[PDB]
Design an enzyme around this catalytic site. Structure first.
Site, PDB file in Angstrom:
ATOM      1  N   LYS A 265      -3.511 -13.195  -1.328  1.00 47.71           N
ATOM      2  CA  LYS A 265      -2.214 -12.974  -0.693  1.00 47.71           C
ATOM      3  C   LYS A 265      -2.259 -13.216   0.809  1.00 47.71           C
ATOM      4  O   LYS A 265      -1.228 -13.166   1.482  1.00 47.71           O
ATOM      5  CB  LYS A 265      -1.719 -11.549  -0.947  1.00 47.71           C
ATOM      6  CG  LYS A 265      -1.390 -11.258  -2.391  1.00 47.71           C
ATOM      7  CD  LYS A 265      -0.564  -9.991  -2.513  1.00 47.71           C
ATOM      8  CE  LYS A 265      -0.239  -9.703  -3.964  1.00 47.71           C
ATOM      9  NZ  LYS A 265       0.822  -8.676  -4.088  1.00 47.71           N
TER      10      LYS A 265
ATOM     11  N   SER B  70       7.040  -4.545   2.217  1.00 47.72           N
ATOM     12  CA  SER B  70       6.189  -4.912   3.341  1.00 47.72           C
ATOM     13  C   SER B  70       6.556  -6.321   3.790  1.00 47.72           C
ATOM     14  O   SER B  70       6.630  -6.611   4.984  1.00 47.72           O
ATOM     15  CB  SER B  70       4.714  -4.868   2.931  1.00 47.72           C
ATOM     16  OG  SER B  70       4.296  -3.542   2.656  1.00 47.72           O
TER      17      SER B  70
ATOM     18  N   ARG C  49      11.772   0.016  -7.756  1.00 46.72           N
ATOM     19  CA  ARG C  49      12.986  -0.019  -6.949  1.00 46.72           C
ATOM     20  C   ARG C  49      13.990  -1.079  -7.394  1.00 46.72           C
ATOM     21  O   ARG C  49      15.125  -1.100  -6.918  1.00 46.72           O
ATOM     22  CB  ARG C  49      12.633  -0.230  -5.473  1.00 46.72           C
ATOM     23  CG  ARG C  49      11.948  -1.548  -5.169  1.00 46.72           C
ATOM     24  CD  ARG C  49      11.665  -1.677  -3.681  1.00 46.72           C
ATOM     25  NE  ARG C  49      11.100  -2.979  -3.330  1.00 46.72           N
ATOM     26  CZ  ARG C  49       9.933  -3.436  -3.773  1.00 46.72           C
ATOM     27  NH1 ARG C  49       9.193  -2.699  -4.591  1.00 46.72           N
ATOM     28  NH2 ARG C  49       9.505  -4.633  -3.398  1.00 46.72           N
TER      29      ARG C  49
ATOM     30  N   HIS D 221       6.320   3.457   0.735  1.00 43.31           N
ATOM     31  CA  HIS D 221       5.042   3.852   0.157  1.00 43.31           C
ATOM     32  C   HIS D 221       4.773   5.326   0.430  1.00 43.31           C
ATOM     33  O   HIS D 221       4.254   6.039  -0.424  1.00 43.31           O
ATOM     34  CB  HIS D 221       3.912   3.017   0.759  1.00 43.31           C
ATOM     35  CG  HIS D 221       4.023   1.555   0.469  1.00 43.31           C
ATOM     36  ND1 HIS D 221       3.939   0.595   1.453  1.00 43.31           N
ATOM     37  CD2 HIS D 221       4.212   0.888  -0.692  1.00 43.31           C
ATOM     38  CE1 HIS D 221       4.076  -0.601   0.910  1.00 43.31           C
ATOM     39  NE2 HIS D 221       4.243  -0.451  -0.391  1.00 43.31           N
TER      40      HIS D 221
HETATM   41  C1  LIG Z   1      -2.910  -4.667  -5.635  1.00 41.87           C
HETATM   42  C2  LIG Z   1      -2.218  -4.593  -7.035  1.00 41.87           C
HETATM   43  C3  LIG Z   1      -2.146  -3.097  -7.526  1.00 41.87           C
HETATM   44  C4  LIG Z   1      -0.758  -5.140  -6.894  1.00 41.87           C
HETATM   45  O1  LIG Z   1      -0.020  -4.378  -5.932  1.00 41.87           O
HETATM   46  P1  LIG Z   1       1.046  -5.110  -4.934  1.00 41.87           P
HETATM   47  O2  LIG Z   1       2.333  -5.502  -5.683  1.00 41.87           O
HETATM   48  O3  LIG Z   1       1.316  -3.939  -3.911  1.00 41.87           O
HETATM   49  O4  LIG Z   1       0.406  -6.312  -4.188  1.00 41.87           O
HETATM   50  C5  LIG Z   1      -2.923  -5.536  -8.115  1.00 41.87           C
HETATM   51  O5  LIG Z   1      -2.841  -6.922  -7.722  1.00 41.87           O
HETATM   52  C6  LIG Z   1      -4.440  -5.169  -8.425  1.00 41.87           C
HETATM   53  O6  LIG Z   1      -4.677  -4.267  -9.302  1.00 41.87           O
HETATM   54  N1  LIG Z   1      -5.410  -5.853  -7.736  1.00 41.87           N
HETATM   55  C7  LIG Z   1      -6.867  -5.632  -7.919  1.00 41.87           C
HETATM   56  C8  LIG Z   1      -7.447  -6.789  -8.782  1.00 41.87           C
HETATM   57  C9  LIG Z   1      -7.098  -6.572 -10.253  1.00 41.87           C
HETATM   58  O7  LIG Z   1      -7.746  -5.795 -10.979  1.00 41.87           O
HETATM   59  N2  LIG Z   1      -6.053  -7.247 -10.715  1.00 41.87           N
HETATM   60  C10 LIG Z   1      -5.533  -7.159 -12.139  1.00 41.87           C
HETATM   61  C11 LIG Z   1      -4.470  -6.166 -12.129  1.00 41.87           C
HETATM   62  S1  LIG Z   1      -3.883  -6.063 -13.762  1.00 41.87           S
END
Ligand SMILES: CC(C)(COP(=O)(O)O)[C@@H](O)C(=O)NCCC(=O)NCCS
Ligand SMILES: CC(C)(COP(=O)(O)O)[C@@H](O)C(=O)NCCC(=O)NCCS
Ligand SMILES: CC(C)(COP(=O)(O)O)[C@@H](O)C(=O)NCCC(=O)NCCS
Lengths: 157, 157, 157, 157, 157, 157
Positions: free
Chosen positions: D40, D127, D89, D16
């Site tokens: 999660k 992670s 990645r 990150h």
């Molecule tokens: C946190 C993240 C960017 C995903 O990232 P991740 O793969 O690091 O968990 C996504 O789940 C998110 O945008 N969460 C906020 C809630 C939301 O708006 N979800 C719809 C995303 S299209």
């Protein structure tokens, strides 16, 4: 345990050296088999590719560089190999590797395909791209053994 | 050469038997290591999975079944293994494999990860799928060792 | 020809409507079968998902919505279906599909799995994504049938 | 140009840090946004993840760490960001990315999703993997910022 | 219901027979359309490919083997086909199949692409590899209908 | 911030216009670099491709269309570009894009690869397929700028 590591090795790269080195640590004898009659005409000739590979693996005692024509499986059979070494890069065409492994298993069941993983350092490069880059005035010194580097410059000059 | 085939084996299927068998024909000794994998909430206890695997591989004299909750790399080092076996049946089962493989290489560089390919017959099954089918009373006798099917039948309903 | 389009449909989206519609233009009768799928902890109960699907497909005279908790293959056989419909929108939605398809073929060989491709408009959505967006009060009216959006709105907040 | 790099960052790894760093060299201001992501069941609380990220990026003057539980698109709009950063990645980390990217584009069309590629060094970590290794007392100092490793050590055992 | 199953069929394999057979069980009439003007020059001529395919599918009553030139979609339209049969092998180039399906949908919306899955037996082989192997002195008898086998030997002799 | 968007653009499509337009909204100046010496001989000549691209992007003020030969990275360096624009279609060869990005990073570290996503409308089409279809009497008007459409008809006439 006799293993065969086939390919065109046109030319042999550090990724290839990485894979064959890892193989020599698991099996008694490793035959680095260089395809003699590609469809694509090589940048380097079979004889050149064999010379380069021999020099690059000179330090590997249980490695034998040999050229072959026609079917790889037929050569492996005559060489009495029972292990077929395949390198799996992160950018590898997995589906193609599966076709190849299954076809070779059909041709010679006693030849077991084993996939090895190169260092992260060589996981995203291919001989195809290296040649392309070198041919277009790009620096690929980092990806090749010194002897291969010198030979490539002369080839493109 | 001592090889370790690690996994959750919950339960061990004919696919796993296929892989371990190919492994024994390649290496002198093979340790089928069953991880506790509590985060996966396994259907069978570690002790149960070990017993099932032991019976399912009784005919394989070069296979040793053991359970562990340690870090995979430490257990491999402590078992004196220098080869890590894993099966490849699909693309999904490739990207995930490279992460574990590179992580294990970081923890124990001398432990070489080897990937084997199962027979076409078992290329589309998994412990997960077999369990899901069994939970719905579907016939899965074809994909599991006899003792494992009985155990799975008894475990369910 | 009787076809069965199975899934969790939690909830049924415009993507599903797209697929079932293409199915009805190809086969005489189509049974949209909603699986209980308890292991997935569905947002809507089976009864709710069935009602939502029934309304969302009221305009499709050749579609019959039914719920089931049986083994997919047995339910298909008992529904007299000989074609199994599934949508394909991405690579991930391919390897998983082949496992189910081959497992279903093993349980019921005469049940032919057919894969249809949704419109570009719905190629990147899923019930899961829609729910996640809705849980964060995002506008998802565009991806769901009217009755389903209302139900989803009411279900949340 | 204001860019937002969203994620769960549970915990933020060197991968990150690699991505956000490349982002700062490209855009004037970068907001590393940590989502609550309750579904999660994160190892660290949002407050903890924010503190860890703040310290891990203290040397980056153009990075601002903030936490949010809102809809990603709304938060981006409210933060006045017009670029959304995400790292790539692997293939798996592509199909899932396109769904979020297209969903976010639907909710906020002016928010352009940009994908950056991490160094080969961090191309196979996550992670999740780091936590799994740490839960088994494996050495992960190499993949995490100093303050994060300490926190992870303290969090476990 | 008229379906079209296009391809170069150079030469027709058991995988092709598997797919067309499954298609004849779902649709009233199936046109096995053989591409008349490839870019790659065929091993077998159009006339030969049509003869081989006709013989290999002689037992399939609702199958019609026909050669065509130019755009497949234009031929399908003139043949009044509404179903486009595509075989999806485990080693298939899914992304390419998606491009093809979408392009064909653009050209002829009334032609619905349906993907069928061959038996596991033919899921890892392609005509391309079969020819390559045969041309290099490899045994591919297992993958071809007897008539195709005899024709291939004469061709390579 | 100078960005470069390289490619063969043979010919330039709506997908290309989509990508370059999105790029001009993030970066100050965008160089649409057209490869001057492909290996595949182009349908349109470099001069034609440059003329078509210039016309198609005439409305984009911060876009500069320039042809180049040899290594793209060497051209980018001389043009003082620090951002390398790559379009990622849903049907993109991700593994190949990774090879390319890593090779280019090796050649010129100061050139950061950024991947943009086209609209769903252009996510499943490639110039390769467009040419193939057009050359075989298929309608591809929808995928090309009007000027490119007119030029293509004259080219195939
Ligand atoms: C946190 C993240 C960017 C995903 O990232 P991740 O793969 O690091 O968990 C996504 O789940 C998110 O945008 N969460 C906020 C809630 C939301 O708006 N979800 C719809 C995303 S299209
Ligand atoms: C059990 C397994 C081999 C994964 O196998 P699986 O796909 O069969 O569940 C892996 O999770 C493991 O090594 N577990 C032990 C704990 C550990 O060291 N994990 C880090 C692995 S890099
Ligand atoms: C519901 C579904 C079709 C999967 O669809 P989904 O991806 O929409 O959840 C599958 O899980 C199913 O068939 N469930 C019924 C139980 C069963 O027979 N499972 C084995 C399937 S091979």
């Amino acid at each position: 345990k006799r293993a065969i590591y086939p390919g065109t090795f046109d030319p042999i790269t550090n990724g290839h050296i990485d894979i064959v080195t890892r193989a020599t640590q698991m099996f008694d004898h490793v035959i680095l088999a260089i395809a003699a009659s590609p469809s694509k005409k090589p940048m380097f000739t079979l004889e050149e590719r064999v010379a380069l590979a021999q020099q690059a693996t000179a330090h590997l005692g249980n490695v034998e560089v040999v050229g072959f024509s026609d079917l790889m499986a037929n050569f492996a059979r005559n060489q009495h190999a029972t292990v077929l070494i395949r390198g799996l890069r992160a950018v590898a065409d997995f589906e193609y590797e599966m076709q190849l492994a299954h076809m070779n298993r059909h041709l010679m069941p006693e030849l077991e395909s084993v996939f090895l993983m190169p260092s992260k350092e060589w996981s995203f490069i291919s001989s195809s791209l290296v040649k392309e880059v070198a041919r277009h005035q790009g620096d690929v010194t980092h990806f090749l053994p010194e002897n291969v580097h010198q030979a490539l410059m002369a080839k493109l000059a």
